[PDB]
Design an enzyme around this catalytic site. Structure first.
Site, PDB file in Angstrom:
ATOM      1  N   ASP A   1      19.032 -50.695  27.797  1.00 43.71           N
ATOM      2  CA  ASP A   1      17.793 -51.188  27.205  1.00 43.71           C
ATOM      3  C   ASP A   1      17.910 -52.693  26.860  1.00 43.71           C
ATOM      4  OD1 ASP A   1      15.037 -50.219  26.157  1.00 43.71           O
ATOM      5  OD2 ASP A   1      15.918 -51.288  24.432  1.00 43.71           O
TER       6      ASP A   1
ATOM      7  N   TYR B   1      12.298 -58.715  20.121  1.00 45.30           N
ATOM      8  CA  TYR B   1      11.048 -58.794  20.908  1.00 45.30           C
ATOM      9  C   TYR B   1      10.178 -60.024  20.600  1.00 45.30           C
ATOM     10  CZ  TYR B   1      11.637 -53.749  22.024  1.00 45.30           C
ATOM     11  OH  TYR B   1      12.075 -52.528  22.463  1.00 45.30           O
TER      12      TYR B   1
ATOM     13  N   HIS C   1      14.777 -42.040  28.748  1.00 41.34           N
ATOM     14  CA  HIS C   1      15.206 -43.334  28.260  1.00 41.34           C
ATOM     15  C   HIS C   1      16.588 -43.391  27.601  1.00 41.34           C
ATOM     16  CE1 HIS C   1      15.280 -46.841  25.549  1.00 41.34           C
ATOM     17  NE2 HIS C   1      14.968 -47.422  26.695  1.00 41.34           N
TER      18      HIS C   1
HETATM   19  O1  LIG Z   1      10.943 -51.656  24.681  1.00 46.35           O
HETATM   20  C1  LIG Z   1      11.816 -51.157  25.379  1.00 46.35           C
HETATM   21  N1  LIG Z   1      12.862 -51.832  25.951  1.00 46.35           N
HETATM   22  C2  LIG Z   1      12.970 -53.275  26.005  1.00 46.35           C
HETATM   23  C3  LIG Z   1      11.766 -54.008  26.614  1.00 46.35           C
HETATM   24  C4  LIG Z   1      11.591 -53.627  28.070  1.00 46.35           C
HETATM   25  C5  LIG Z   1      12.859 -53.962  28.858  1.00 46.35           C
HETATM   26  C6  LIG Z   1      14.069 -53.253  28.275  1.00 46.35           C
HETATM   27  C7  LIG Z   1      14.221 -53.627  26.811  1.00 46.35           C
HETATM   28  C8  LIG Z   1      14.422 -55.117  26.735  1.00 46.35           C
HETATM   29  C9  LIG Z   1      13.252 -55.864  27.328  1.00 46.35           C
HETATM   30  O2  LIG Z   1      13.514 -57.252  27.202  1.00 46.35           O
HETATM   31  C10 LIG Z   1      13.109 -55.458  28.790  1.00 46.35           C
HETATM   32  C11 LIG Z   1      12.002 -55.513  26.543  1.00 46.35           C
HETATM   33  C12 LIG Z   1      11.714 -49.733  25.745  1.00 46.35           C
HETATM   34  C13 LIG Z   1      11.872 -49.390  27.069  1.00 46.35           C
HETATM   35  N2  LIG Z   1      11.730 -48.147  27.530  1.00 46.35           N
HETATM   36  C14 LIG Z   1      11.383 -47.216  26.627  1.00 46.35           C
HETATM   37  N3  LIG Z   1      11.189 -45.922  27.124  1.00 46.35           N
HETATM   38  C15 LIG Z   1      10.450 -44.984  26.298  1.00 46.35           C
HETATM   39  C16 LIG Z   1      10.169 -43.739  27.094  1.00 46.35           C
HETATM   40  C17 LIG Z   1      10.161 -42.680  26.031  1.00 46.35           C
HETATM   41  O3  LIG Z   1      11.121 -43.071  25.057  1.00 46.35           O
HETATM   42  C18 LIG Z   1      11.197 -44.492  25.082  1.00 46.35           C
HETATM   43  N4  LIG Z   1      11.239 -47.450  25.314  1.00 46.35           N
HETATM   44  C19 LIG Z   1      11.407 -48.702  24.867  1.00 46.35           C
HETATM   45  C20 LIG Z   1      11.267 -48.877  23.386  1.00 46.35           C
HETATM   46  C21 LIG Z   1      12.338 -48.080  22.676  1.00 46.35           C
HETATM   47  C22 LIG Z   1      11.679 -47.483  21.450  1.00 46.35           C
HETATM   48  C23 LIG Z   1      10.225 -47.864  21.488  1.00 46.35           C
HETATM   49  C24 LIG Z   1       9.931 -48.387  22.872  1.00 46.35           C
END
Ligand SMILES: O=C(N[C@@H]1[C@@H]2C[C@@H]3C[C@H]1C[C@@](O)(C3)C2)c1cnc(N[C@H]2CCOC2)nc1C1CCCC1
Ligand SMILES: O=C(N[C@@H]1[C@@H]2C[C@@H]3C[C@H]1C[C@@](O)(C3)C2)c1cnc(N[C@H]2CCOC2)nc1C1CCCC1
Ligand SMILES: O=C(N[C@@H]1[C@@H]2C[C@@H]3C[C@H]1C[C@@](O)(C3)C2)c1cnc(N[C@H]2CCOC2)nc1C1CCCC1
Ligand SMILES: O=C(N[C@@H]1[C@@H]2C[C@@H]3C[C@H]1C[C@@](O)(C3)C2)c1cnc(N[C@H]2CCOC2)nc1C1CCCC1
Ligand SMILES: O=C(N[C@@H]1[C@@H]2C[C@@H]3C[C@H]1C[C@@](O)(C3)C2)c1cnc(N[C@H]2CCOC2)nc1C1CCCC1
Ligand SMILES: O=C(N[C@@H]1[C@@H]2C[C@@H]3C[C@H]1C[C@@](O)(C3)C2)c1cnc(N[C@H]2CCOC2)nc1C1CCCC1
Lengths: 546, 546
Positions: A334, A465, A523
């Site tokens: 992640d 973020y 995830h």
């Molecule tokens: O936000 C996420 N990851 C980040 C984002 C997108 C990507 C990977 C990281 C770093 C980034 O820079 C690039 C910003 C992210 C990515 N995928 C999921 N899948 C969800 C599916 C169900 O459970 C969680 N969930 C999240 C969060 C985790 C808890 C709330 C949402």
């Protein structure tokens, strides 16, 4: 009612038995049958081997005494020992052939999980051979799964002497009728039986486990595949490095070999790697499992800019500098996966190899601001909810137990939407107040995350973020580069945000990229599919990172 | 008045310069003189090498661009490049030939010790070659001796562009007249001179250091041999392992490679190894410098029996188990030296090799109680003063600063008797209230020991001496053994308690024993003669512990 289970090492927890190997050596050297056993047992309780087993002398002191017994035995049998005869070589081979009897260890693990006190009781020696590490490693891997390890050479007593059985009972704090004792030597079971213990003669593993299964009333054979070994936080070595005056980074460390730095995602902990830490250390690596900046026992400064990728990467470089590491393998998941790709892009000299779970390599789009990119990619619309300081903190901190139980679920157990977070005004708006416990986690594991997040909460984690413009401008400096160091991308079939197709253009930037893929995985990769994650990472580390 | 000194890497802090090596490659390949420099510089500020140096592309992306420039140059010069021509090979050899210019680094270290802010300003690249670790190690060793490292590929600017000089000045927080800038490239000095900095053209190290010595008014050439690198406690990685419910062991960790566990004496600290930690890590070892049980940040339970050798050794074994180490090299001094011999005797499988400073291997005398042994050996009569709980604690805790300044002195600076401690009723009875500072230690180093001992005082440390009967009975179990693992005994000429002659019978128990001996060295070996300790330990580790 049985409450304790005792296992022998040779011929029980480890196979083949030394004398099983030696029977074959005897035949190959065309020696009279039983000559090695006879020379080994020479003098019985008054002999060289009893002194060895009681810790009076070391294995290297014993080797020439065994040689002399072999000469005496061969003289009496009217046979000549072969020209190349060496007790040192013969015993080195027998010790090295010995491997963990995985079905026996699995049964010991199941019994302990069901509340049994477990122990290893072994006739062993003080090993000072140049090759002693082999046996030290085996004993190290085994002993950690048991409550007690009782070695003849450390207690000055041997099986089948009655005193060692009384010592065992005192150590266990159990009555003999509460103990089940497993041994491949019939004479070693007699004193245990004599005291009233249940005994099993181990001739073949399957039959012995059938007897054990019947006497305990616990299923040991034909069981589902067990999970990999986890971590008990209080038994780990905890490390602390100050990277700058106000920032200290905490990590858990296990093993020896090439350094492997594990970088967790949002909103996680070093503990998200619990199933990987023991496995990677056993695989021959020195594991450093971080609490990333803003989490757990690491510092969590309040400022947004403390969490931009440029600062976070610089700090990880300082972390290596202060520990005296020229390089580490960086494995991320992640937000950790995003960070590791950027470590590979900006600091390739410090990165031995790079691996990401779920997070593809995401290059900057120089023609669009990150907000315009979110507008064109609504799967990421929920990230807008994380922008305003305090809003997502209030929801995530309101009820920590609810937060972690709602987030940490398998793909089919989802209680979150993701696609309508902005419209609905939160992550848990249409989620229950008391979510059920995912099949992935125990209440105890959830409570460890709750405890960790009570220290700093979600401000630091959410600030990861809040640096889109800074991260974009910094990432733009790397647009003419390619990632040419060893790299692995692991996709998860059922991660509905970080879909496998999002990684499809990675070969354009990372031409030599290696891949892994996990079926029916959401995830939370490390805890969803730990055995599969371990297999993929170890295979890749062994081929590309050593 | 000069306040800052800036050094280039290639041709200044590291020798030979890449283009020095390449001039020789050009001649060996019989190429036209200057062809490699010409192809390297091709296009100047618009060329491939400027993109490399600014971090736009990696070294591996640059290699084929340099190959094409070499072809273009050879075509114009009407010459044929040799059949085996490879920029990859040529550059790998030049990078690998580069070593730290020790006299230049020594001068940078002297200036920083005198209050100068120091920096490295270098035209460098993003190294993603399979062999990148070589250069990563060199940069790691160098950078830690400087306040700043400014790399062209990280800042997106190159020398001789004027902006990088303004960046340097901003980083230093100094006016140009306060800076001395050293470079082997005349064109790179011009912008620094232009701003008003003092510049030195480095053609040969001796002449450059003479100019530097004259302009700073600080002696840099012909100086006494410097002490090895020490440790700043706040910059180390600090580790913590719980060995049992009430006992946690603290350690400082540095480096990678085979684990080397350093065990201090009485009444000391992990900090007694300050001169060894950086040197052993640089030598290719993973150093674990303990706070032994009862000291510093480790637990100090009150009970005497918590400090018997059997318990202390069992705990060190648990320490290895919890860190996931099958073995470590054990190096001890004083009480630590006593412990390590016993680790070798009782746990040889966990001990890769053993070394002691001053403490010989002391076997138990089965025919005399330890009190009868002290009666027959009055050099150890002072240990009777340590027996009664509270008595020695009261004297040692009364004034911590006085305690450490009185104890930590060279053989010729002694303020203690030792031979009349019992008769006089204490260690410091005929010692001054305000002892002078030994030439071995600084006031700051003394105050670190004072701070460490404020936590638990001397009860735990003194309890190490309060287990003579338990230790004797336990040691008697090992009387039939020999130490056959790799072992080193280091004697100190002027240690008037642990005299070199006390080690004279060690070969009877340790037949393959290796030895070291330090002239004009008192009891506090590590700080008395650090350079000599380092030389002896590294030579032995490299031959016997790898
Ligand atoms: O936000 C996420 N990851 C980040 C984002 C997108 C990507 C990977 C990281 C770093 C980034 O820079 C690039 C910003 C992210 C990515 N995928 C999921 N899948 C969800 C599916 C169900 O459970 C969680 N969930 C999240 C969060 C985790 C808890 C709330 C949402
Ligand atoms: O522990 C054993 N023997 C003891 C020695 C020699 C004798 C008899 C006992 C007690 C002593 O005091 C005197 C010390 C012993 C007995 N039988 C077998 N193998 C059996 C299974 C397969 O082949 C035979 N193996 C051992 C050792 C287990 C590890 C190395 C061999
Ligand atoms: O997902 C993207 N960017 C991220 C999202 C949106 C923004 C910016 C990053 C980081 C975020 O956290 C925020 C999550 C993203 C944006 N634009 C493009 N290509 C563009 C060029 C060609 O066509 C579109 N590609 C991607 C991914 C990389 C390959 C497949 C998709
Ligand atoms: O930095 C140098 N050149 C720069 C490149 C090429 C050109 C000129 C500058 C600025 C650029 O932008 C354009 C990038 C440069 C100049 N001269 C020498 N050696 C000298 C000492 C011994 O032999 C010559 N060495 C270098 C590099 C230092 C590390 C590898 C070689
Ligand atoms: O007591 C000492 N060491 C221990 C004894 C003897 C040996 C080595 C360790 C562990 C033992 O088990 C065996 C018990 C010991 C040994 N040598 C010296 N040399 C003095 C000369 C001047 O400065 C200190 N000093 C001490 C003490 C350190 C401060 C007060 C005296
Ligand atoms: O120094 C000795 N013992 C230690 C002293 C006195 C006691 C017991 C240990 C630990 C102490 O802390 C307390 C310091 C000691 C005692 N007895 C003998 N040999 C005997 C056998 C033959 O002749 C005498 N040898 C030694 C040393 C080992 C070789 C040279 C001297």
């Amino acid at each position: 009612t049985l409450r304790a289970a005792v296992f022998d090492l040779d011929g029980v927890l480890a196979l083949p038995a030394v004398f099983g190997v030696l029977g074959r050596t005897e035949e190959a050297l065309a020696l009279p049958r039983g000559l090695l056993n006879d020379a080994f047992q020479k003098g019985g309780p008054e002999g060289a081997t009893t002194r060895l087993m009681k810790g009076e002398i070391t294995l290297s002191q014993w080797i020439p005494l065994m040689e002399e017994n072999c000469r005496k035995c061969s003289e009496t049998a009217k046979v000549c020992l072969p020209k190349n005869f060496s007790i040192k070589e013969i015993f080195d081979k027998a010790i090295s052939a010995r491997k963990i009897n995985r079905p026996m260890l699995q049964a010991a693990l199941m019994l302990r999980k069901k509340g049994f006190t477990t122990a290893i009781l072994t006739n062993t020696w003080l090993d000072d051979r140049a090759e002693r590490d082999g046996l030290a490693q085996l004993m190290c891997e085994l002993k950690m799964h048991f409550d007690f390890l009782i070695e003849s050479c450390q207690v000055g007593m041997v099986k089948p002497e009655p005193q060692i059985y009384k010592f065992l009972l005192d150590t266990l704090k159990a009555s003999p009728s509460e103990v089940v004792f497993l041994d491949d030597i019939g004479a070693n079971l007699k004193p245990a039986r004599d005291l009233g213990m249940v005994t099993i003669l181990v001739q073949d593993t399957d039959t012995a486990l059938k007897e054990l299964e019947k006497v305990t009333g616990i299923q040991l054979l034909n069981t589902p595949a067990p999970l990999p070994t986890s971590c008990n936080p209080s038994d780990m070595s905890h490390g602390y490095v100050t990277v700058k005056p106000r920032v200290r980074l905490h990590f858990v460390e296990l093993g020896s070999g090439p350094a492997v730095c594990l970088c967790h995602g949002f909103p996680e902990s070093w503990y998200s790697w619990r199933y990987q830490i023991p496995a990677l250390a056993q695989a021959g690596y020195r594991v450093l499992a971080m609490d990333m900046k803003g989490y757990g026992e690491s510092s969590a400064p309040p400022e947004i800019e403390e969490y931009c990728m440029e600062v976070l990467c610089k700090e990880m470089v300082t972390f290596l500098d202060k520990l005296g590491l020229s390089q580490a393998v960086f494995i991320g998941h992640d937000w950790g996966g995003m960070l590791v790709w950027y470590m590979a892009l900006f600091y390739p000299e410090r990165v031995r190899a790079v691996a990401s779970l779920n997070t593809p390599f995401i290059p900057a789009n120089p023609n669009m601001s990150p907000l315009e990119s979110i507008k064109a990619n609504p799967v990421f619309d929920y990230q807008l909810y994380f922008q305003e300081p305090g809003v997502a903190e209030a929801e995530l901190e309101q009820n920590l137990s609810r937060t972690f139980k709602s987030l940490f679920r398998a793909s089919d157990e989802s209680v979150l939407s993701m696609h309508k977070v902005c419209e609905a005004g939160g992550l848990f708006v249409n989620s229950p107040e008391e979510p059920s416990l995912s099949r992935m986690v125990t209440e105890e594991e959830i409570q460890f995350y709750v405890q960790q997040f009570k220290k700093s909460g979600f401000r630091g984690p959410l600030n990861w973020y809040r640096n889109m413009e800074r991260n974009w401008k910094w990432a733009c400096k790397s647009l003419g580069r390619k990632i040419l160091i060893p790299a692995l991308m692991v996709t998860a079939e059922k991660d509905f945000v970080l879909v496998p197709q999002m990684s499809q253009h990675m070969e354009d930037w990372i031409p030599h990229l290696k891949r892994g893929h996990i079926e029916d995985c959401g995830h939370w990769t490390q805890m969803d599919k730990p055995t599969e994650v371990n297999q993929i990472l170890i295979k890749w580390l062994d081929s590309d990172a050593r």
